[PDB]
Amino acid sequence: SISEKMVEALNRQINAEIYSAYLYLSMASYFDSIGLKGFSNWMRVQWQEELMHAMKMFDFVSERGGRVKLYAVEEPPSEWDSPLAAFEHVYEHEVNVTKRIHELVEMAMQEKDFATYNFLQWYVAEQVEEEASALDIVEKLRLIGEDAAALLFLDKELSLRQF
Amino acid sequence: SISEKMVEALNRQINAEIYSAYLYLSMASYFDSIGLKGFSNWMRVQWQEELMHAMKMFDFVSERGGRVKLYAVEEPPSEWDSPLAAFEHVYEHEVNVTKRIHELVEMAMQEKDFATYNFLQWYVAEQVEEEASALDIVEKLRLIGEDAAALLFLDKELSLRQF
Amino acid sequence: SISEKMVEALNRQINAEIYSAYLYLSMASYFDSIGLKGFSNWMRVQWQEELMHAMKMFDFVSERGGRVKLYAVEEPPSEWDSPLAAFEHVYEHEVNVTKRIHELVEMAMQEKDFATYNFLQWYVAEQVEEEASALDIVEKLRLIGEDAAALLFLDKELSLRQF
Amino acid sequence: SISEKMVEALNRQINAEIYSAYLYLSMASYFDSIGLKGFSNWMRVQWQEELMHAMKMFDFVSERGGRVKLYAVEEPPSEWDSPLAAFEHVYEHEVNVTKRIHELVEMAMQEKDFATYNFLQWYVAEQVEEEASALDIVEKLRLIGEDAAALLFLDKELSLRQF
Amino acid sequence: SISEKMVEALNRQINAEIYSAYLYLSMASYFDSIGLKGFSNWMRVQWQEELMHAMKMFDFVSERGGRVKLYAVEEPPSEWDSPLAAFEHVYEHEVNVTKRIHELVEMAMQEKDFATYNFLQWYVAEQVEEEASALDIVEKLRLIGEDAAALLFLDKELSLRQF
Amino acid sequence: SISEKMVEALNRQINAEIYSAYLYLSMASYFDSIGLKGFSNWMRVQWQEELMHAMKMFDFVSERGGRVKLYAVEEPPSEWDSPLAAFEHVYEHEVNVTKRIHELVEMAMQEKDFATYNFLQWYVAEQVEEEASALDIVEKLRLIGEDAAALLFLDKELSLRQF
Amino acid sequence: SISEKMVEALNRQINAEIYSAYLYLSMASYFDSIGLKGFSNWMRVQWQEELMHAMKMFDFVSERGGRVKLYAVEEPPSEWDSPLAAFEHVYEHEVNVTKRIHELVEMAMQEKDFATYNFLQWYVAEQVEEEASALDIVEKLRLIGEDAAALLFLDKELSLRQF
């Protein structure tokens, strides 16, 4: 069934997804440090969601008879210049994750691994949803600029996100 | 306000709890590879529990006005000789975690960080329950030996664990 | 049995807790005087909570067979430069109360008064939470600066606090 | 627009009500010391009641656009010859609070502060109730003499009072 | 893993806790024999509570991987001079138990047995509560003296205690 | 009228019932140390049952106007070669208890103590029930031999027993 | 077949049981006269209880194919020196009934009337209970002496008894 090369690639993507979760956890600490618990909540939910994406893939590898190997998770950045900068990095990060998925889809096609190709379609669609969510918040923060009231208000809205 | 030195030691312990979670996730992969989905379930719940313990500490540091910094997570082992060998490593690992907590407690004492000392007591108590759970499973696996019926029976019982 | 030295120290701490309550009542009057009834509500809740903490210690002294003696409660300050100034004084005061508890813990240890030592751990944890709550509000007030939409927004949030 | 002289008198009465509370809290310590936890209960409810009366006047001053100023609270007595003697002092003290209320009412009339005059009528009526309640208990304690079954029966009755 | 010396000390305490229960069962027989079934009820509940306290420590030793060793439970007194004398002996006994706990806690500190030290804090606090309850009753009985109405009244109250 | 000789004999049997409880508590420790928490549960339940049986006789002696004297409870064995050997010992112990009841009954007969004779009939029936349960478990363990799967299956079954 | 001899003995015992009821009714009249309606209530319930005991033996004689013959019921005593004396007489009377029962049982064994022997065991047990309830009240009445608050308190408790 699934090739060793695809197993390795999927295992790297599991690592990338776990790293994503960890990056967002780092941002949650950043937001706590400046008193934005609502923004921190957003990140904490996001951390939970990425772990869930990693586990879906973890399960898939094992389902195809492959063996998941776990790799080191790199230390993430820990400081941003502002909420706006944090969210622009979220967007940029998710654009890169989308590129990784894109390459995995290409690789499945090239290998005629139809099961993995089909499985990755969920991630193609999920990445669209993620980039859009980040971009929407980036747009708002650009509008907000240095307006404290507007920031505190968005913080309250973000505190409502749940897992 | 929590001291810099204690913030560093607690950020280290957060990393150790995350690593513990990750080690158990790796064990989950090992158990999947040998078709023991119940044992795998046990490890997946344990992975979620360790992440909860890490977040509790994460929150405590931030609450005392400290800054949580996330560090690289070590690549865990991925192979064990047997179910019994895996759970013996769970036990050994937890004993080591208990020792790190011990040294954390001693450090809070020596610095008269009464808040952290009191906070850590929850972890001291938690480590007792963790070692005992792992040891009870080790005890059963030694009894089981090569008894395939006994092994699958335990597997099924472990499958019932929830988070 | 509980020493007279300890009874006296605990009676002084009971006074300090009643004074803390009184200080927050005074800040309540101050926030009422500038049209911030939400901040005032937060203070009125805090005054009730401090009296509960005092009563808890009142009961313990009696329970250990000691006699509670009540002392004069000093007149507290009644004016602050700004809402931010007030909450910075809240934080500074709570830091001071944490110091008192710290020295009570030390005294309990010195005297090998294990029951008092243990009783005081509740206050060690409670002080962590109180500092954290005051610190959060200070963080937001710094962020708020002069933005009235922001102040009134915070005022409204604080008005939802209940005892 | 409330008078400054009336703001001062009312602030003075707020202090007297808080002192009353404090007097009763001290009697609660006294009753605990001689093992009468029911009598202690009665005083603790009474301490809560007096604080409530204080708060009602605190809000009225602020509602009238006055500025509540908090003053030092006197150290109360802490020992009484007997339960009977304690409640005779409660009665005596209440008669004296009633005198102050009376002088505040006269003052309100004199200054034609109709709003304060009307507000103070609640306190006029309330004092009738408090004097009556203390006197009824004095009456019982005189009947009781040294009959221990009778004291403990009253103690049990008092322990049922709720705030 | 818990040290052999500590296992021994904890086993001795388990025996002390079981003897305590047994002492109260004996007191229960004494109260039955003088028509004080309410008092007997109080003792029977206490016998149940002490065994529950023993069992918690029994469980803790086992969980730390120690082996509980059970020792003979000594023969308690079967007669007291009066209800007051029985309860004075309850108090005196609980003070002795408290000293045992105190020495156990010191031993834990000295051995740097943080898990046990922490476990014992629950017993530290439980003893405070127990001594207070006993003293309360002792104080009542001193007051009651030879007053049969008061004795029967207290008997009725004690008959309401439940486990 | 209950003879002193019968009161003494019943007191000795009350003691034997408590020893039984204590013996099962010791087996509970044994079963814990070898990983069989289910067998331990059975013992824990049995220990509570024996105390209840003891309390019933405790109450009957008091009821007949006797005075229950509690005697030292001797130290029980603490170790066995195997689960089977432990349960063979349970059976052997219950047979011995049965002969003690038998002797008590013969004694009641000889003294024409009809009330005691009647009362003991409950114990004669209960012994039948208790011997049979122990025997059924002994039969299963003989069947089980060294079969680990069968042993763990019994253990889970025994874990469901409740008090 | 139940002997004519046993039928007669049983009929005389039915008479004895109806007489017991009548004695207690007479005591009800006594307590009513001295204003103790709670004590009277206990007696009336006892009258009902004894009639029921009589009826069970009435039904048994008929069930064995015997013929119940009713005999005259004697006039009972109507006066006692005090509540304590009445209750001492309750006790003494029950001891006498217990001796009747004891002799009926001996008669049953002697005649090898196993059915009657077995039936009587209910009465052996019941007499134990009756003696115990009477004795507990006697013990309380000794305690009470001339204490009126005490006697009236007992009176109140007894008023709660129901059929």
Side-chain angles (χ1 to χ4, degrees), chain E residues 21-33 36-37 39-41 43-45 47 76-78 80, chain F residues 2 6-7 9-18 50-71 104 119-120 122-123, chain G residues 128 132:
Chain E
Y22 207 39
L23 171 63
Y24 306 145
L25 193 60
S26 189
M27 285 185 172
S29 161
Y30 162 80
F31 285 115
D32 280 331
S33 78
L36 299 177
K37 265 64 170 179
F39 278 83
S40 189
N41 178 64
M43 291 296 164
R44 294 162 179 269
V45 178
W47 135 271
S78 62
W80 296 264
Chain F
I2 215 302
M6 186 55 78
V7 170
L10 292 176
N11 284 339
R12 287 299 175 181
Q13 181 59 30
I14 286 162
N15 193 80
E17 306 275 345
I18 301 169
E50 304 292 334
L51 299 175
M52 294 300 277
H53 298 176
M55 285 295 90
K56 184 182 168 76
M57 188 171 282
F58 176 100
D59 292 341
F60 174 86
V61 177
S62 176
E63 231 190 1
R64 314 259 338 257
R67 187 67 207 12
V68 181
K69 186 171 175 183
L70 294 178
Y71 301 111
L104 262 187
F119 175 73
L120 289 171
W122 187 94
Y123 287 82
Chain G
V128 164

Side-chain angles (χ1 to χ4, degrees), chain D residues 10-89:
Chain D
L10 295 181
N11 284 351
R12 210 183 199 283
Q13 181 62 20
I14 285 164
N15 189 83
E17 304 261 7
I18 294 174
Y19 175 75
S20 286
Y22 208 39
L23 174 62
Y24 302 145
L25 184 60
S26 185
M27 293 179 175
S29 170
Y30 164 75
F31 283 117
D32 277 341
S33 77
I34 69 197
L36 293 177
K37 291 184 165 187
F39 282 81
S40 184
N41 180 66
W42 191 93
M43 291 296 166
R44 297 157 175 266
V45 180
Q46 198 61 40
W47 134 272
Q48 301 174 80
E49 233 88 304
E50 297 303 329
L51 293 184
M52 284 189 38
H53 300 175
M55 292 307 121
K56 184 184 172 75
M57 189 173 288
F58 182 110
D59 300 337
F60 176 83
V61 172
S62 181
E63 198 184 20
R64 298 285 315 278
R67 181 81 159 95
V68 167
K69 222 301 185 53
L70 293 178
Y71 297 99
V73 181
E74 178 185 21
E75 171 177 330
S78 66
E79 275 292 340
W80 291 266
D81 299 345
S82 59
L84 171 63
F87 267 92
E88 304 187 302
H89 276 93

Side-chain angles (χ1 to χ4, degrees), chain D:
Chain D
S1 167
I2 183 172
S3 170
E4 174 61 54
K5 289 102 103 309
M6 187 62 68
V7 171
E8 290 181 30
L10 295 181
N11 284 351
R12 210 183 199 283
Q13 181 62 20
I14 285 164
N15 189 83
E17 304 261 7
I18 294 174
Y19 175 75
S20 286
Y22 208 39
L23 174 62
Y24 302 145
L25 184 60
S26 185
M27 293 179 175
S29 170
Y30 164 75
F31 283 117
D32 277 341
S33 77
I34 69 197
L36 293 177
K37 291 184 165 187
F39 282 81
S40 184
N41 180 66
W42 191 93
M43 291 296 166
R44 297 157 175 266
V45 180
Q46 198 61 40
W47 134 272
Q48 301 174 80
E49 233 88 304
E50 297 303 329
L51 293 184
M52 284 189 38
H53 300 175
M55 292 307 121
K56 184 184 172 75
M57 189 173 288
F58 182 110
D59 300 337
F60 176 83
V61 172
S62 181
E63 198 184 20
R64 298 285 315 278
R67 181 81 159 95
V68 167
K69 222 301 185 53
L70 293 178
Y71 297 99
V73 181
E74 178 185 21
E75 171 177 330
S78 66
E79 275 292 340
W80 291 266
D81 299 345
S82 59
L84 171 63
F87 267 92
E88 304 187 302
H89 276 93
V90 170
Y91 183 81
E92 300 168 22
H93 174 75
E94 298 183 343
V95 169
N96 288 347
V97 167
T98 301
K99 297 184 184 192
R100 298 171 87 121
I101 293 306
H102 184 99
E103 309 183 323
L104 288 169
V105 167
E106 286 179 324
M107 174 172 184
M109 304 186 323
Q110 194 267 331
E111 298 174 353
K112 294 190 164 80
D113 179 345
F114 292 151
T116 299
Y117 172 92
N118 175 68
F119 174 80
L120 291 169
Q121 300 308 293
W122 186 94
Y123 289 83
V124 173
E126 173 67 19
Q127 285 299 121
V128 167
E129 184 165 18
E130 298 201 0
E131 281 181 31
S133 288
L135 181 61
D136 183 64
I137 293 174
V138 164
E139 279 161 357
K140 306 296 202 50
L141 293 171
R142 291 184 84 245
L143 162 58
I144 278 169
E146 269 86 357
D147 178 343
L151 193 50
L152 297 194
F153 182 75
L154 184 50
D155 180 82
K156 230 297 186 171
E157 287 190 300
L158 275 33
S159 82
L160 293 169
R161 192 183 182 193
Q162 303 191 145
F163 177 49

Side-chain angles (χ1 to χ4, degrees), chain B residues 29-138:
Chain B
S29 165
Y30 164 67
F31 285 118
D32 281 340
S33 76
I34 63 185
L36 300 172
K37 264 74 161 180
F39 281 83
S40 196
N41 182 62
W42 193 93
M43 291 294 168
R44 298 155 176 269
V45 171
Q46 197 68 38
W47 130 274
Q48 300 175 87
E49 286 193 358
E50 298 304 325
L51 296 179
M52 289 313 189
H53 304 168
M55 289 300 90
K56 171 180 177 60
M57 189 166 295
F58 183 99
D59 293 347
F60 175 81
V61 170
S62 172
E63 174 176 40
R64 311 260 332 264
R67 183 91 154 84
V68 175
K69 191 186 210 341
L70 297 174
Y71 300 108
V73 185
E74 182 186 20
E75 176 179 334
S78 54
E79 279 297 337
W80 294 264
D81 297 343
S82 66
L84 168 58
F87 264 92
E88 284 176 335
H89 285 267
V90 174
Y91 181 74
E92 304 156 23
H93 174 69
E94 288 171 349
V95 168
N96 295 339
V97 169
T98 290
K99 301 188 181 188
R100 294 176 201 122
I101 290 293
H102 185 95
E103 298 169 9
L104 263 187
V105 168
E106 292 182 326
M107 178 184 178
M109 293 196 291
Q110 167 265 319
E111 300 176 2
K112 294 173 230 64
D113 180 350
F114 293 154
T116 297
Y117 171 97
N118 168 72
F119 175 74
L120 286 171
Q121 297 309 296
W122 184 93
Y123 290 80
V124 166
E126 177 64 24
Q127 284 307 120
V128 179
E129 302 173 32
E130 296 214 12
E131 293 181 31
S133 290
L135 182 58
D136 184 61
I137 289 166
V138 166

Side-chain angles (χ1 to χ4, degrees), chain C residues 89-120:
Chain C
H89 281 280
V90 173
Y91 181 81
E92 299 163 4
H93 181 66
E94 288 299 333
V95 166
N96 287 338
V97 173
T98 303
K99 290 181 241 174
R100 290 174 193 112
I101 295 298
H102 182 104
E103 315 207 23
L104 286 166
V105 167
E106 269 170 330
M107 180 182 171
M109 293 189 308
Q110 177 258 306
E111 303 179 347
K112 304 221 199 66
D113 184 349
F114 290 155
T116 300
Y117 175 85
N118 174 64
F119 175 71
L120 288 175

